[PDB]
Amino acid sequence: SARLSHVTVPVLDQDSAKEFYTEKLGFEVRNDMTMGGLRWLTVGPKDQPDVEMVLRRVGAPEYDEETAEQLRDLVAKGVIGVGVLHVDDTRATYERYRAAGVIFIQEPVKRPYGTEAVFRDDSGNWFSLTDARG
Amino acid sequence: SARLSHVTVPVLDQDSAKEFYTEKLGFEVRNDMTMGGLRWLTVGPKDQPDVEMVLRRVGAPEYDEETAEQLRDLVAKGVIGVGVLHVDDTRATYERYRAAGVIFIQEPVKRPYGTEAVFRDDSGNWFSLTDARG
Numbered sequence: 156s157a158r159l160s161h162v163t164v165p166v167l168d169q170d171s172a173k174e175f176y177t178e179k180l181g182f183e184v185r186n187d188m189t190m191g192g193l194r195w196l197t198v199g200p201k202d203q204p205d206v207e208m209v210l211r212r213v214g215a216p217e218y219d220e221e222t223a224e225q226l227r228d229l230v231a232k233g234v235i236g237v238g239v240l241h242v243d244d245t246r247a248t249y250e251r252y253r254a255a256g257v258i259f260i261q262e263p264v265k266r267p268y269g270t271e272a273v274f275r276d277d278s279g280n281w282f283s284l285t286d287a288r289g
Numbered sequence: 290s291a292r293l294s295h296v297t298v299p300v301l302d303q304d305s306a307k308e309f310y311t312e313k314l315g316f317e318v319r320n321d322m323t324m325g326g327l328r329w330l331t332v333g334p335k336d337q338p339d340v341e342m343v344l345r346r347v348g349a350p351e352y353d354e355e356t357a358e359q360l361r362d363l364v365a366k367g368v369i370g371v372g373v374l375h376v377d378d379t380r381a382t383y384e385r386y387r388a389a390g391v392i393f394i395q396e397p398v399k400r401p402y403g404t405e406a407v408f409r410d411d412s413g414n415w416f417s418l419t420d421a422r423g
């Protein structure tokens with residue numbers, strides 16, 4: 156009975172990510188704790204307890220120094236898509252997030268499955284934001 | 290309100306990823322279809338109907354070929370950590386997973402929070418496998 160509890164999000168700076176996720180997206184801090192130099196910083200939306208996002212530092216030691224530079228570069232250019240956030244109304248969440256300071260790379264567009272928008276976090280990772288259409 | 294419904298998993302080849310996730314891990318196929326020339330393929334744990342893992346081809350349309358090549362190299366080198374699977378017993382799951390061809394790169398190890406192992410899929414992406422045992 157394996158289940159997914161957390162999703163790894165590579166971030167450029169943990170303090171900056173923590174602020175973006177909690178103040179801009181309204182997520183809450185589920186863990187913030189350090190063990191052997193590793194800051195275990197996890198966040199999730201207010202409703203969903205089963206799945207957290209791990210805001211994982213990209214740097215020494217868990218990343219080799221060359222590897223780091225290459226990941227950190229792919230992250231800043233928006234190549235890492237974390238996944239899909241499902242909400243009741245994409246246009247409402249769009250405007251809420253946008254009025255806080257979230258940068259959208261795609262405004263809400265109607266798709267066969269719902270209304271979809273695309274935003275990016277503070278590092279440049281992207282999320283699709285989705286509806287079953289209002 | 291918000292929840293994370295899909296997690297993106299960058300795969301090298303989709304047919305190969307589908308076998309790994311369904312045959313080795315025992316995940317169920319929640320979606321498999323095409324439109325355009327693009328394959329929407331999602332899988333998930335049996336007991337977790339609310340989260341899908343999107344097995345996304347790293348390749349042309351969606352990724353330019355420079356970016357695509359750089360991410361295929363990172364993926365193949367085990368740089369991309371997808372997330373954390375939670376089980377009742379890491380050591381028993383490690384065993385059951387080893388029985389089908391799952392390659393662990395970290396064996397079960399006692400940590401302040403639980404016992405942790407680390408495996409890789411057929412592309413090279415890695416998962417933490419965790420429990421609450423000491």
Ligand SMILES: Cc1cc2nc3c(=O)[nH]c(=O)nc-3n(C[C@H](O)[C@H](O)[C@H](O)CO)c2cc1C
Pocket residue numbers: 239268283285322323324327329351
């Ligand atoms: C039948 C079909 C269903 C899809 N359903 C969804 C969906 O429910 N949510 C979603 O984010 N994307 C869905 N996608 C595609 C995906 O979001 C899209 O190709 C990328 O986000 C664009 O880069 C679907 C694609 C197909 C062909």
